[PDB]
Write an enzyme that holds these catalytic residues in place. Structure first.
Site, PDB file in Angstrom:
ATOM      1  N   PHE A 119       0.800  -1.212   0.000  1.00 14.26           N
ATOM      2  CA  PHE A 119       0.000   0.000   0.000  1.00 14.26           C
ATOM      3  C   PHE A 119       0.838   1.271   0.000  1.00 14.26           C
ATOM      4  O   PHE A 119       0.263   2.360   0.066  1.00 14.26           O
ATOM      5  CB  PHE A 119      -0.942   0.004   1.218  1.00 14.26           C
ATOM      6  CG  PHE A 119      -0.236  -0.118   2.539  1.00 14.26           C
ATOM      7  CD1 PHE A 119       0.079  -1.358   3.067  1.00 14.26           C
ATOM      8  CD2 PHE A 119       0.094   1.006   3.263  1.00 14.26           C
ATOM      9  CE1 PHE A 119       0.725  -1.468   4.268  1.00 14.26           C
ATOM     10  CE2 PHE A 119       0.737   0.899   4.473  1.00 14.26           C
ATOM     11  CZ  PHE A 119       1.053  -0.342   4.976  1.00 14.26           C
ATOM     12  N   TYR A 149      -3.607   2.708  12.809  1.00 13.92           N
ATOM     13  CA  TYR A 149      -4.835   3.307  12.295  1.00 13.92           C
ATOM     14  C   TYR A 149      -6.103   2.575  12.708  1.00 13.92           C
ATOM     15  O   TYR A 149      -7.173   3.190  12.776  1.00 13.92           O
ATOM     16  CB  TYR A 149      -4.808   3.316  10.772  1.00 13.92           C
ATOM     17  CG  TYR A 149      -3.964   4.374  10.133  1.00 13.92           C
ATOM     18  CD1 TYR A 149      -4.550   5.380   9.394  1.00 13.92           C
ATOM     19  CD2 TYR A 149      -2.583   4.351  10.235  1.00 13.92           C
ATOM     20  CE1 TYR A 149      -3.794   6.345   8.793  1.00 13.92           C
ATOM     21  CE2 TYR A 149      -1.814   5.315   9.637  1.00 13.92           C
ATOM     22  CZ  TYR A 149      -2.427   6.311   8.921  1.00 13.92           C
ATOM     23  OH  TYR A 149      -1.667   7.273   8.312  1.00 13.92           O
ATOM     24  N   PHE A 171       5.896  -3.643   7.916  1.00 13.99           N
ATOM     25  CA  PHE A 171       6.777  -2.621   7.356  1.00 13.99           C
ATOM     26  C   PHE A 171       8.183  -3.172   7.223  1.00 13.99           C
ATOM     27  O   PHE A 171       8.773  -3.618   8.212  1.00 13.99           O
ATOM     28  CB  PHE A 171       6.806  -1.370   8.232  1.00 13.99           C
ATOM     29  CG  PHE A 171       5.597  -0.508   8.107  1.00 13.99           C
ATOM     30  CD1 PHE A 171       5.617   0.612   7.301  1.00 13.99           C
ATOM     31  CD2 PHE A 171       4.445  -0.802   8.812  1.00 13.99           C
ATOM     32  CE1 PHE A 171       4.508   1.412   7.191  1.00 13.99           C
ATOM     33  CE2 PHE A 171       3.336  -0.012   8.703  1.00 13.99           C
ATOM     34  CZ  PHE A 171       3.363   1.100   7.894  1.00 13.99           C
TER      35      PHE A 171
END
Lengths: 145, 756, 107, 329
Positions: free
Chosen positions: C36, C82, C99
């Site tokens: 993303f 988030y 990540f």
């Protein structure tokens, strides 16, 4: 009158023996009849706007109608017709509508027609509309399934 | 699966093209939130690779190009084009060093007279103000939240430029495998990209020189390669090429007007200096005669517009000036005029074109001398372009009023104002929403508190901020004439701004007065709550009276009195719907009216009769516009009505109960009525001596209203705030004072009524 | 909640301390999903600093438990991150994130 | 106060605005005939030598067809279309360059008069009488109620066409009308005729006192300095309308005039003559009301006489029109 005819004729999920409460020999023609009915309901609307505008009361009805069997042909076609000439029906959305459309896309597969429909749903002419637009962006699942 | 298999699958190719169209649409014009959101599903380098590719199914190349344009450049290009045809300038030496600019062999004005795509022009052009893309940053809880997702521009420019040269060289060979099986997919949305960047002002002078050198020989810079235009081509490329050429025409025009201002500042400086010297030798070294008085009549007895006008007609004529000026600064203007015409498409006699205008004038007819041309967009484009390159001076005349030169030391404020204006024009096209009206109001408050709006209002008259504000106002108001009045409280602030704009002028009132019938048509949908009402700003138009009310047209007056007829018929459902007693009319509506009609005649003391006669005649012809408690069809008493009003006001059990009192509004309504009628006096002491017609109006008046009740209205006092306090929510001293003006204008005390 | 799984080149000593601009040339990934985001494509390796609530605190807690020159794979819990509604149009809710990270930290 | 001791930026603004000794408004005349002849010359481009038994359109013909195409499409209203207005004025000025301008003791020869019949009629055919005649008449079906400048430009083009006779284009107009078989033209015409200005006296009083009240300060008096377009304001429109209706039946056609009386193939009938007479009735009624005002006086004000001039010229054009309907019985 035609809408009432469709409504009393809508209430037939299979219309095989469920339409054979008047027996056979009419249930056979039932599918052709209802397809022709939605065809005429598309035919009366293309280019018009006065006929286009009236479905602000009828929008949730038609998007809920969607009998799944004779609808990908013509119900979607008239839906494409009405959602061009009329921004007055564009701006009355409840967010169940696009979700049902997205479920229809999933259950009927990769159709470009639905995509052109949403392309028209974003804009009538010149002016954009942001609420339903952002709803479309988030309901386009970025899970990407 | 690799994407190139769509060239033989043919079913998902269309689906991907339509998905791409969806991303292009739902990245709406001026939706940068979704633009930043979109760069996760795709990627800047992915778009770069797709851009750089040569193998494709056709349409997806164009859609990827156009999606890039939709994301990173559409808002920029549109906001630039809004502020594009607006030719302002600050004074700098860069402004001064501008002319036609032919340098060369001392014949460049006759020879190659420079180019567009050239260096400095010093307009005022707000930047783009991107925002860099990212996703990991935590949210804020409002704000725009997003400007436009950024990208490198200069490397991108070089990439697009080499792509252009590569496509040109590939098309020069007449390949049997074009990019996409068709040259239109090869001379293609790259054209759209370079045009978008060019409009957005990215390109350096070498870049625009290079893409003009693509059209090398007809330009033929001072210092085979077949250009792009002379080759036979399809139609849509002609459309994009004309959309390219419009830029260069606009740049030549822009340079022209800036050269004009460069002439203008030095000219007005030396001219006012010479005028100072002339006034000095006239007044200080007069040795006075009749010629001294004749020259002295100019300065004190002429405004500066008339002064420069007379000075200019002295500055040129058919040798019939009768001029004071020296005949040296009359010659530089003449040579300037001639060189300006020479820049225009006039040989002034009184193949190789070697210019833009003769080139395109030959070329577009060469196109029409090719086959029959469908696609009428191409037609309108071609002929608009052609008409421009003949009456170019006419286009300059069209550009004359829109231009406005200013000094520096205001540009810092103007740029904030212009960026706010671009935010207005971005919020124009979009349908209204809560954050939109909030941002709208924030910009509105940003601009009113700048002092430059006040300092140069004629500039705002040239731009047309007011009509745009009006347009958005009727957009939010209109559609729902009485059902949908969603999103007010920006209407209030914008109407307040229009009141301010009308205030600080002599002609903004005029510039609204033309639109006044529309404003009253929307005032028909007003008539509700407090705040800046459309009819309030309508009344703000003409209170600078005695030039407009004369030139007013009757058609609005039947309108407002019919609104008042409905006021006297309709019970105000907006204010009846809160538990209120349902009186057959509303005093609050009529009081919201008639301050307009008062302001028709108020400050202009003892106002006119051509207006008042039709006013009172239409009013008496519809007696229901009066309080029918007073002037009903039968038994209708004045002091009976105010006694009932006081009984209701002092007894709120028979009154409605927010922050509005009935009998207060009733007596206020009749107070405004009698104040109007006093200011609608049939005459004053000028002509009531020498007329009977105005005394006919006085007779109709006195037959309607008697005395002995106005003095009864004086016999209605009120208590004092002492122990202890009071509140003026029910009864008003100023409204007992309202009948005074009427009584003074009509009757006049003789001997004894003063004593009474 | 944050749990690091490091590939350990680099010094392994110089942690990014407070009041410092750590610069990671990173890329994200989703729990049984796809990418993303990536600093690698955009060629701007994300010059930001620590303790400022710029990035979500899962990324910051990962940034605390690393060094110069190292390379880690940083899980991310949704309530830390988030995910209660997610970045709309880009991330759905209950997003468990991943990540890749590679960095110098000029302080 | 003088021009100097003033801000220079406002000075240069006033200079460029007040630029009247050297305005752009001077004769150019280098964009009308050299403009127009190039198109019809290029339409006979020798390089475009196909010989396919149907010669392709000219550029001018393509232009006229584009404007007819956007005319014939359906909607309620029209845009402003500055392009159409510009090219209409261009064409009308081109053909009228022979009519006006081209037509002390200027005693012309009969030979040169005959020479000046030509150089118009050539410019008529150069205009594409062929297309433009149907174009201008197709438009008025659309611009049907409005007094738009679009409309006036079309009318001026018709006047520039039809000026000296041209029974040819009269025939072409008539054939287009009797092939289109269309209401919309005549009813639009009667709506136009129903909305044309006459004398007003309240307005005359108002503007008269306003010009009397010349008490406006600097930068506040030149805005409404003249204001002379307040009372009639429609000379160049209304005179040209009646001149157009005159100029159709100038040559004693005797079949067109009947068609002006009545519309047979169409469904409905109008008799526009009746509308002319009603307009004349309202006009002279207003003139008599103007008379009774000044009848108390012995001397007349100058602006009143000045308005009376145009008011009489209007009725002169109308009388010439009504003569040309039936002059030719």
């Amino acid at each position: 009158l035609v809408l009432n005819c469709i409504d009393r004729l809508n209430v037939y999920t299979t219309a095989a023996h469920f339409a054979e409460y008047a027996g056979e020999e009419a249930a056979e023609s039932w599918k052709e009849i209802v397809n022709l009915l939605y065809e005429l309901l598309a035919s009366l609307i293309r280019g018009n706007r006065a006929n286009c505008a009236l479905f602000s009361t009828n929008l949730d009805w038609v998007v809920s109608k969607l009998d799944r069997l004779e609808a990908s042909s013509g119900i979607l076609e008239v839906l494409y017709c009405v959602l061009i000439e009329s921004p007055e029906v564009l701006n009355i959305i409840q967010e169940n509508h696009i979700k049902s459309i997205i479920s229809l896309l999933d259950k009927h597969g990769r159709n470009h027609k639905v995509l052109d429909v949403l392309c028209s749903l974003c804009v009538c002419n010149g002016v954009a509309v942001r609420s339903n637009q952002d709803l479309i962006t988030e309901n386009l699942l970025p899970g990407r399934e | 699966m690799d994407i190139l298999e769509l060239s033989e699958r043919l079913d998902l190719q269309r689906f991907h093209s339509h998905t791409l169209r969806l991303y292009r649409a739902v990245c709406a014009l001026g939706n940068n939130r979704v633009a930043h959101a979109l760069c996760s599903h795709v990627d800047q380098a992915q778009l770069l690779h797709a851009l750089e590719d040569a193998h494709l199914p056709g349409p997806l190349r164009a859609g990827y190009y156009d999606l890039l344009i939709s994301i990173h450049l559409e808002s920029a290009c549109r906001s630039r084009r809004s502020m594009l045809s607006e030719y302002i300038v600050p004074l700098t030496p860069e402004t001064r060093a501008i002319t036609l600019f032919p340098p060369g062999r001392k014949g460049g004005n006759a020879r190659r007279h420079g180019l567009p795509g050239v260096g400095v022009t010093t307009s005022l052009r707000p930047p783009h103000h991107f925002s860099p893309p990212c996703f990991v940053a935590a949210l804020p809880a409002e704000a725009p939240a997003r400007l436009s997702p950024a990208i490198p521009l200069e490397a991108l420019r070089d990439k697009a430029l080499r792509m252009l040269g590569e496509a040109v060289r590939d098309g020069g060979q007449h390949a049997r495998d074009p990019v996409g099986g068709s040259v239109e997919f090869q001379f293609v949305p790259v054209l759209k990209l370079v045009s978008t960047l060019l409009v957005m002002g990215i390109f350096g002078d070498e870049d625009v020189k290079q893409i003009l050198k693509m059209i090398e020989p007809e330009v033929f810079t001072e210092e085979l390669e077949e250009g792009l235009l002379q080759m036979k081509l399809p139609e849509s490329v002609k459309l994009q090429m004309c959309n390219l050429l419009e830029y260069f025409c606009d740049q030549e025009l822009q340079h022209r007007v800036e050269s004009l201002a460069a002439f203008a500042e030095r000219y007005v400086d030396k001219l006012q200096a010479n005028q100072r010297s002339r006034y000095a030798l006239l007044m200080r070294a007069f040795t006075m005669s009749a010629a001294e008085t004749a020259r002295r009549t100019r300065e004190f007895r002429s405004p500066p517009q008339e002064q420069i006008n007379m000075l200019l007609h002295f500055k040129d004529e058919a040798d019939e000036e009768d001029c004071p000026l020296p005949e040296d600064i009359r010659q530089d203007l003449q040579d300037f005029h001639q060189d300006l015409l020479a820049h225009c498409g006039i040989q002034l006699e009184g193949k190789k074109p070697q210019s833009l205008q003769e080139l395109v004038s030959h070329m577009v007819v060469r196109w029409a001398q090719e086959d029959y041309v469908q696609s009428p967009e191409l037609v309108r484009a071609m002929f608009s372009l052609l008409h421009r390159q003949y009456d170019g001076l006419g286009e300059l005349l069209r550009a004359l009023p829109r231009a406005y030169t200013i000094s520096p030391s205001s540009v810092e404020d103007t740029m904030s104002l212009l960026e706010c204006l671009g935010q207005i024009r971005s919020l124009l096209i979009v349908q209204m929403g809560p954050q939109e009206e909030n941002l709208m109001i924030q910009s509105i408050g940003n601009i009113m508190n700048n002092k430059v709006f006040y300092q140069h209002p004629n500039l705002m008259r040239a731009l047309g901020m007011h009509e745009t504000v009006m347009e958005v106002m009727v957009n939010v108001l209109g559609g729902g004439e009485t059902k949908e009045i969603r999103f007010p409280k920006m209407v209030t602030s914008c109407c307040r701004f229009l009141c301010y704009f009308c205030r600080i002028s002599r002609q903004n009132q005029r510039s609204m007065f033309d639109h006044l019938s529309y404003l009253l048509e929307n005032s028909g949908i007003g008539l509700g709550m407090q705040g800046s009402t459309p009819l309030d700003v309508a009344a703000a138009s003409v209170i600078d009276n005695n030039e407009l009310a004369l030139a007013l047209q009757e058609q609005d007056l039947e309108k407002v009195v019919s609104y008042l007829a409905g006021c006297g018929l309709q019970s105000c459902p907006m204010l009846l719907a809160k538990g209120y007693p349902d009186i057959g009319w509303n005093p609050c509506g009529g009081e919201r009216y008639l301050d307009f009609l008062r302001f028709a005649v108020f400050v202009n003391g003892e106002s006119v009769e051509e207006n008042a006669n039709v006013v009172v005649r239409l009013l008496i012809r519809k007696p229901e516009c009066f309080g029918p408690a007073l002037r009903g069809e039968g038994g209708s008493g004045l002091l009976a009505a105010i006694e009932e009003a006081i009984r209701i006001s002092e007894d709120p059990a028979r009154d409605g109960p927010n922050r509005v009192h009935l009998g207060h509004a009733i007596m206020s309504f009749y107070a405004a009525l009698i104040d109007l009628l006093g200011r609608c006096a049939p005459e004053m002491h000028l002509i009531q001596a020498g007329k009977g017609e105005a005394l006919r109006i006085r007779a109709i008046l006195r037959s309607l209203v008697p005395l002995d009740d106005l003095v009864g209205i004086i016999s209605l006092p009120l208590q004092i705030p002492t122990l202890q306090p009071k509140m003026s929510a029910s009864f008003v001293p100023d409204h007992k004072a309202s009948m005074v003006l009427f009584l003074d204008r009509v009757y006049g005390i003789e001997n004894q009524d003063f004593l009474l | 909640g944050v749990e690091i799984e490091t590939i350990s080149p680099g010094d392994g000593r110089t942690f990014p301390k407070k009041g410092q601009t750590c610069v990671v040339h990173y890329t994200g990934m989703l729990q049984n999903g796809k990418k993303f985001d990536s600093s690698r494509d955009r060629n701007k390796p994300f010059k930001f600093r620590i303790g400022k609530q710029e990035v979500i605190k899962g990324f910051e807690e990962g940034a605390a438990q690393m060094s110069l020159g190292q390379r880690a794979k940083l899980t991310c819990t949704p309530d830390v991150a988030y995910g209660a509604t997610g970045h709309p149009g880009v991330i759905p809710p209950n997003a468990t994130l991943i990540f890749d990270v590679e960095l110098l930290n000029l302080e | 106060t003088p021009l100097y001791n003033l801000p220079t930026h406002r000075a240069c603004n006033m200079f460029l605005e007040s630029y009247k000794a050297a305005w752009i408004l001077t004769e150019d005349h280098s964009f009308e005939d050299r403009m127009i002849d190039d198109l019809s010359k290029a339409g006979e481009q020798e390089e475009e030598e196909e010989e396919v038994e149907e010669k392709k359109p000219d550029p001018l013909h393509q232009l006229v067809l584009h404007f007819s195409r956007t005319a014939l499409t359906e909607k309620s209203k029209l845009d402003e279309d500055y392009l159409y207005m510009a090219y209409a004025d261009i064409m009308a000025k081109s053909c009228h360059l022979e009519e006006g301008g081209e037509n002390e003791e200027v005693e012309v020869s009969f030979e040169e008069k005959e020479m000046e019949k030509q150089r118009l009629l050539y410019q008529q055919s150069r205009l594409h009488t062929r297309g433009a005649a149907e174009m201008v008449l197709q438009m008025i079906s659309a611009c049907k109620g409005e007094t738009g400048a679009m409309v006036s430009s079309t009318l001026k083009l018709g006047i520039s066409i039809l000026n000296g006779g041209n029974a040819e284009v009269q025939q072409k107009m008539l054939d287009y009308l009797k092939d289109k078989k269309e209401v919309g033209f005549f009813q639009s015409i009667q709506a136009l005729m129903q909305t044309c200005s006459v004398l007003d006296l309240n307005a005359f009083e108002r503007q008269n006192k306003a010009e009397g009240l010349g008490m406006v300060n600097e930068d506040g008096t030149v805005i409404n300095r003249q204001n002379g377009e307040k009372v009639m304001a429609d000379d160049e429109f209304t005179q040209d309308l009646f001149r157009f209706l005159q100029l159709l039946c100038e040559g004693h056609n005797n079949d067109f005039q009947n068609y002006l009386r009545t519309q047979t193939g169409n469904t409905t009938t109008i008799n526009i003559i009746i509308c002319t007479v009603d307009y004349l009735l309202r006009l002279q009624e207003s003139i008599s009301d103007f008379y009774w005002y000044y009848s108390g006086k012995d001397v007349i004000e100058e602006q009143g006489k000045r308005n009376f001039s145009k008011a009489m010229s209007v009725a002169k054009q109308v009388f010439n029109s009504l003569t040309e309907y039936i002059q030719g019985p």
